[PDB]
Amino acid sequence: IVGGRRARPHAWPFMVSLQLRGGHFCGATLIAPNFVMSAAHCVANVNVRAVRVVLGAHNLSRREPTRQVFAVQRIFENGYDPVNLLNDIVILQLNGSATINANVQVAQLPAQGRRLGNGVQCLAMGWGLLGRNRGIASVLQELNVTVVTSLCRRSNVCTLVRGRQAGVCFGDSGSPLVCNGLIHGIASFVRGGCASGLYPDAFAPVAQFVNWIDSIIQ
Numbered sequence: 001i002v003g004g005r006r007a008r009p010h011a012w013p014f015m016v017s018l019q020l021r022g023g024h025f026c027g028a029t030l031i032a033p034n035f036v037m038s039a040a041h042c043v044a045n046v047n048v049r050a051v052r053v054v055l056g057a058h059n060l061s062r063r064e065p066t067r068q069v070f071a072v073q074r075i076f077e078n079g080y081d082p083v084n085l086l087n088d089i090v091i092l093q094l095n096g097s098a099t100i101n102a103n104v105q106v107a108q109l110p111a112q113g114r115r116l117g118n119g120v121q122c123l124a125m126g127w128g129l130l131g132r133n134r135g136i137a138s139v140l141q142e143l144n145v146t147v148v149t150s151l152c153r154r155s156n157v158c159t160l161v162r163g164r165q166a167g168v169c170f171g172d173s174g175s176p177l178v179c180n181g182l183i184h185g186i187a188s189f190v191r192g193g194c195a196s197g198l199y200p201d202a203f204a205p206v207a208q209f210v211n212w213i214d215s216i217i218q
């Protein structure tokens with residue numbers, strides 16, 4: 001997240017960090033005790049059996065007892081198109097079920113097909129790069145963004161910060177976009193580099209995949 005701010009500790013208990021030996025590489029959202037939702041791009045070229053799903057985290061640089069770590073048991077895809085950057089969503093079934101508490105919670109999803117109008121206010125978040133040249137964040141970052149339909153296709157939910165350069169960046173892919181209390185997007189891709197101030201950030205439109213999601217998590 002470029003130009004954002006540190007989130008209050010555990011302000012978003014549904015926020016997930018996907019990690020590999022080296023550490024954080026993508027975000028995710030807890031949508032049920034044993035299911036997380038992320039971007040298909042995140043697991044396209046990675047050894048799923050090596051991925052660690054970290055719940056209840058805030059500062060990735062410190063050892064946190066509030067954390068709960070799981071492995072990926074199964075993957076559910078929905079037609080991800082790596083060339084056109086479409087259907088960038090995947091559901092990862094965990095090797096166990098999370099203990100729901102103050103630091104680990106299930107997110108609320110929108111109604112199937114619900115679209116967001118131009119002007120909707122959302123909150124983007126993630127442990128991605130802090131700048132168009134700053135590196136991965138230690139403390140979870142959040143950012144106020146506005147939904148825009150221009151310079152965006154109907155197959156995406158896009159957002160833009162006006163009056164300054166800010167937005168999601170590398171490492172934020174798969175992270176949730178919260179709008180009106182519901183997870184309406186999954187960070188997918190940027191254009192013109194991070195926080196260009198020109199191209200809106202693109203997210204997978206969660207609302208379009210609700211019936212699919214529900215068929216899997218019950």
Ligand SMILES: *[C@@H]1O[C@H](CO[C@@H]2O[C@@H](C)[C@@H](O)[C@@H](O)[C@@H]2O)[C@@H](O[C@@H]2O[C@H](CO)[C@@H](O)[C@H](O)[C@H]2NC(C)=O)[C@H](O)[C@H]1NC(C)=O
Nearest residue numbers: 012120121122123124143144145146177178179180181182
């Ligand atoms: C910046 O964003 C915060 C948080 O956004 C809201 O909550 C998110 C979880 C998501 O649901 C978004 O769609 C929401 O817009 C805004 O904080 C709210 O501020 C109002 C007063 O302006 C207050 O009454 C609410 O309780 C706050 N909500 C929360 C959860 O903190 C804030 O207004 C935004 N600022 C700007 C200038 O956009």
